[PDB]
Amino acid sequence: KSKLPKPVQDLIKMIFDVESMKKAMVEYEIDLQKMPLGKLSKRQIQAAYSILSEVQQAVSQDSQILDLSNRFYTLIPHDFKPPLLNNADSVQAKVEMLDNLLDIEVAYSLLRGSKDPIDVNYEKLKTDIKVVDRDSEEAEIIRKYVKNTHATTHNAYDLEVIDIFKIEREGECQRYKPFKQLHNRRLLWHGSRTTNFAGILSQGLRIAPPEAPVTGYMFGKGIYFADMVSKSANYCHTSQGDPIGLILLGEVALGNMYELKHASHISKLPKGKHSVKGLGKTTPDPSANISLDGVDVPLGTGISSGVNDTSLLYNEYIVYDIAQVNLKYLLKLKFNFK
Ligand SMILES: Cn1ncnc1[C@H]1c2n[nH]c(=O)c3cc(F)cc(c23)N[C@@H]1c1ccc(F)cc1
Numbered sequence: 001k002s003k004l005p006k007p008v009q010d011l012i013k014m015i016f017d018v019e020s021m022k023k024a025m026v027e028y029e030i031d032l033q034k035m036p037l038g039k040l041s042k043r044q045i046q047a048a049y050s051i052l053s054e055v056q057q058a059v060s061q062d063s064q065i066l067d068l069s070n071r072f073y074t075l076i077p078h079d080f081k082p083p084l085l086n087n088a089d090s091v092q093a094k095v096e097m098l099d100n101l102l103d104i105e106v107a108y109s110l111l112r113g114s115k116d117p118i119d120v121n122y123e124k125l126k127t128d129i130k131v132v133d134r135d136s137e138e139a140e141i142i143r144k145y146v147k148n149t150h151a152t153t154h155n156a157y158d159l160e161v162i163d164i165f166k167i168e169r170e171g172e173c174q175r176y177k178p179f180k181q182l183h184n185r186r187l188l189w190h191g192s193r194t195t196n197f198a199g200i201l202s203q204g205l206r207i208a209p210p211e212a213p214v215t216g217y218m219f220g221k222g223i224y225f226a227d228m229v230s231k232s233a234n235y236c237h238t239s240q241g242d243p244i245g246l247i248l249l250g251e252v253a254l255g256n257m258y259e260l261k262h263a264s265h266i267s268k269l270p271k272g273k274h275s276v277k278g279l280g281k282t283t284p285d286p287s288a289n290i291s292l293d294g295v296d297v298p299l300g301t302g303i304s305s306g307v308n309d310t311s312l313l314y315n316e317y318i319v320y321d322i323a324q325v326n327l328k329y330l331l332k333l334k335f336n337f338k
Pocket residue numbers: 092096189190191192215216217218224225226231232233235315316317
């Protein structure tokens with residue numbers, strides 16, 4: 001029997017849920033026979049990324065695109081008439097599929113490679129996880145952040161916080177050290193599919209590989225965060241059939257922000273800048289900022305930023321070095337769909 005709190009045990013089950021892994025693969029139309037969880041290979045996936053990059057290029061300028069489509073389906077067997085990879089959104093969906101596959105492989109490997117099994121798998125995450133007491137001020141601050149920064153245009157659901165966890169990944173403090181005293185450190189959201197979280201906890205937030213198409217990345221390949229909970233929660237890809245999601249709060253060392261109103265695929269920041277801020281029309285009210293253990297929490301309700309000429313409804317924040325993030329909390333959220 002495990003010594004871990006029930007909420008933590010429930011999180012471990014959730015994150016190592018093999019059935020969720022398989023359901024995801026069925027929804028992607030992957031052939032589970034020909035490409036089982038244990039068989040996923042880093043080198044095949046890398047080659048698949050490159051083919052998707054060639055596809056995107058061929059689309060941007062009918063026979064050759066059929067052949068590339070087929071080369072992709074040979075590398076990543078599907079179980080379908082096979083849809084042509086002939087537009088940016090289709091390509092993007094396959095890239096996101098490959099990302100999700102990669103983290104699923106990580107989860108499956110950890111799982112397969114005397115004590116209660118929940119405890120054995122907990123240890124494999126190499127992450128200290130503690131429950132934040134529902135009645136603490138810490139929890140209250142976090143619930144406020146969730147409540148106040150739900151955007152008015154994300155009306156498909158409300159959020160309810162079920163559990164709040166405090167997390168410390170092995171090695172992250174040391175890795176974050178050079179950034180620990182950069183100025184402008186902010187507690188920001190990052191949402192991702194549940195089936196990615198074993199990978200995220202064991203390896204941290206990562207940046208897309210060189211081989212991946214840049215298409216879809218408004219500010220280039222980086223790690224993206226929001227100051228509005230719902231903007232991030234949308235990337236949980238929850239649904240009525242699976243309405244429980246996981247979302248992170250990260251301390252992000254933003255330093256001097258390169259403020260942008262429109263897409264720009266950053267390959268190198270201007271010297272002296274440490275992050276990108278995509279400027280939204282709505283921003284959390286600066287007067288309501290609260291410090292939490294030295295870090296600003298922009299938990300104000302949304303007001304007008306005064307920026308009209310922008311591509312974005314809400315802010316986003318991007319860093320280009322994985323060491324500029326120190327993960328602090330993990331929330332289990334129930335999405336109540338309307
Ligand atoms: C899909 N994805 N994969 C890695 N990162 C993400 C997204 C993202 N994930 N999670 C967040 O919380 C987030 C919060 C934002 F303000 C903005 C975000 C994100 N945009 C990122 C984005 C969107 C489309 C795209 F093609 C590439 C990147």
